[PDB]
Design a protein around this ligand. Structure first.
Ligand SMILES: [Zn+2]
Ligand SMILES: [Zn+2]
Lengths: 10, 66
């Protein structure tokens, strides 16, 4: 899968 | 040409970031739990969003054995 781990924005 | 795909840094569900899982053919990225069905673990392969899995426009494998 094209998984990403960016910053949460919430 | 090179398949330089694009992935959203925001989930298609709540437009939030973090633990995203993006589709192969579609730039949308999603959150594991926000998906339906929700992913609990990352899938190995070409992952497709719900729309893509519903886009089986062709014959959905006719299993008429009778
Ligand atoms: Zn989400
Ligand atoms: Zn898609």
């Amino acid at each position: 899968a094209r998984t990403k781990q960016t910053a949460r924005k919430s | 040409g090179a398949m330089a795909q694009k992935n959203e840094d925001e989930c298609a569900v709540c437009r939030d970031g973090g633990e995203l899982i993006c589709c192969d053919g579609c730039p949308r990225a999603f959150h594991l739990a926000c998906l339906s069905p929700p992913l609990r673990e990352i899938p190995s392969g070409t992952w497709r969003c719900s729309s893509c899995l519903q886009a089986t426009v062709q014959e959905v494998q006719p299993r008429a054995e009778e």
